[PDB]
Ligand binder design. Structure first.
Ligand SMILES: CC(=O)N[C@H]1[C@@H](OP(=O)(O)OP(=O)(O)OC[C@H]2O[C@@H](n3ccc(=O)[nH]c3=O)[C@H](O)[C@@H]2O)O[C@H](CO)[C@@H](O)[C@@H]1O[C@H](C)C(=O)N[C@@H](C)C(=O)O
Ligand SMILES: CC(=O)Nc1ccc(Sc2ccc3nnc(N)n3n2)cc1
Ligand SMILES: CC(=O)Nc1ccc(Sc2ccc3nnc(N)n3n2)cc1
Ligand SMILES: [Cl-]
Length: 431
């Protein structure tokens, strides 16, 4: 791709938009940037020579563009962006720009839950083999910052939003880990529209890796599969990872636990195998990886109480993965809240029966979450209020679990800030 002389407009003054500004400037193109937010987080990090427009989309700029670069946070269905598409103005995202420049194979990972774990695992498998690997995308390091002529393999976590604006991805190995309701505020044609965006990841992929236990991960119309009791990669119950009936790893050697993390390990191994990484070093990486911050992270274990930061549980399916099979000796104090993105929370209710569960519900959708079981629920405005309410009630044997089933953007800079604030309060209140 050659952008010289083009009128380039970037939508979004967040992490993605700033990475795109740097990308174009380094290639001799001065873009313009807009964002519907009046004071977006990148407003003061923008180079002084770059024109900026905030508080709305600027149709004068969009309709004059040769190329529109849309951050994943702007809907293609926004009327101004849809009008530009109607006029035949090219619209891409940062992942598209990346794919046009990358010169190493790409492993591409999407799904409603498990993405960052699988992405990081494949990266660790590559590192264990001595491969120069770049890991990024939706996990938090903008993909354009990975571009490096010495890179031998890229591992990208991709969201449905990023996939909507991507056309040139030809992954060496691609997966949809699972499909459960999320981002319904962005998908007015519902679950199948969200699924269709994720299904784009398989187009022109050399190997597709599907979840044998989740039919929505399969192309609508020759894929490798992983699953619990079936699949090319599957579990054998002590629990083993197996490939086509052959034991490859006793999961006692992993640091992660839980069935969903064992299938994450299977998916990572299937992708690593498809990318040509040596099996021995891939298996080694499964035994060294300890987990990610904010993903079912024990931030304090003291006086018989475990305080668990699962702030990365931004949808119902992720909270379900925390709750399904969860063992608690005493009472579970569960923190739910934030921006639910129009999700139906009712699938959580089957985990919330019995005498040993208390709900502390906060943020934009706190009332809807407390309605799951009002007789054991309290509602506050903020997470801090919820923590100060529950802490006097905690007894040895209890668990305090932040697994909020919602996005954090109504009250926090990012889910990391939500998790960090939870950890600070847990240390104050629990020690
Ligand atoms: C919403 C989203 O896709 N966020 C990803 C994005 O971060 P970035 O800061 O660039 O986001 P953005 O595109 O500026 O959008 C951020 C927020 O601003 C809003 N926004 C954005 C542009 C605009 O004109 N108006 C507006 O209101 C968006 O709706 C959203 O609420 O790019 C980063 C690098 O690729 C990702 O790590 C990050 O994943 C975050 C963690 C996320 O929540 N992703 C979603 C998809 C998920 O995991 O479910
Ligand atoms: C249908 C099919 O066979 N798809 C495919 C996808 C990826 C690869 S690996 C690779 C290596 C360098 C490179 N540079 N750009 C890109 N997309 N790649 N991909 C092989 C085949
Ligand atoms: C079996 C099934 O459910 N297939 C399906 C596939 C895609 C969609 S998404 C869609 C559908 C219509 C439409 N009209 N305008 C827009 N933007 N859309 N989007 C939904 C269902
Ligand atoms: Cl968030």
């Amino acid at each position: 791709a050659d952008y010289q002389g083009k009128n380039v407009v970037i939508i979004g003054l967040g992490l993605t938009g700033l990475s795109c500004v740097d990308f174009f400037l380094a290639r001799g193109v001065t873009p313009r940037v807009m964002d519907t937010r009046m004071t977006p987080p990148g407003l003061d990090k923008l180079p002084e020579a770059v024109e900026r427009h905030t508080g709305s989309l600027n149709d004068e700029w969009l309709m004059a563009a040769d190329l529109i670069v849309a951050s994943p946070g702007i809907a293609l269905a926004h009327p101004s962006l849809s009008a530009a598409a109607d006029a035949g103005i090219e619209i891409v995202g940062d992942i598209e720009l990346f794919c046009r420049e990358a010169q190493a194979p790409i492993v591409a990972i999407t799904g409603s839950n498990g993405k960052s774990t699988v992405t990081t695992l494949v990266g660790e498998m590559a590192k264990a083999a001595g491969v120069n690997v770049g890991v990024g995308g939706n996990i938090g390091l903008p993909a354009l910052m990975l571009l490096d002529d010495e890179c031998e393999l890229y591992v990208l976590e991709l969201s449905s939003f990023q996939l909507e604006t991507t056309s040139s991805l030809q992954a060496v190995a691609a997966t949809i880990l699972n499909v459960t309701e999320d981002h319904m505020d962005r998908y007015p044609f519902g679950l199948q529209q969200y699924r269709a965006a994720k299904l784009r990841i398989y187009e022109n992929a050399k190997v597709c890796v599907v979840n044998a236990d989740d039919a929505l991960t399969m192309p609508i119309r020759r894929c490798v599969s992983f699953g619990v009791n079936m699949g090319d990669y599957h579990l054998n119950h002590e629990t083993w990872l197996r490939v086509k009936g052959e034991k490859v790893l006793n999961v006692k050697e992993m640091k992660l636990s839980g069935q969903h993390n064992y299938t994450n390990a299977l998916a990572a191994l299937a992708l690593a195998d498809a990318a040509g990484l040596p099996r021995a070093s891939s298996l080694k990486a499964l035994t060294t990886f300890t987990g990610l911050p904010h993903r079912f992270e024990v931030v304090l274990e003291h006086n018989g109480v475990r305080w668990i930061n699962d702030s990365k549980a931004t949808n119902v399916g992720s909270t379900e993965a925390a709750l399904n099979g969860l063992h608690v000796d005493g009472t579970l104090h569960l923190l739910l809240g934030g921006d639910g993105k129009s999700a139906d929370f009712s699938p959580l209710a089957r985990y919330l029966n019995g005498d040993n569960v208390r709900l502390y519900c906060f943020g934009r959708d706190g009332a809807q979450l407390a309605a799951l079981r009002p007789e054991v629920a309290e509602q506050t405005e903020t997470m801090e209020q919820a923590m100060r309410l529950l802490a006097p009630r905690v007894q040895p044997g209890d668990m305090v679990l932040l697994s909020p089933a919602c996005a954090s953007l109504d009250q926090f800079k990012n889910f990391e800030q939500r998790g960090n604030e939870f950890a600070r309060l847990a240390k104050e209140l629990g020690g």
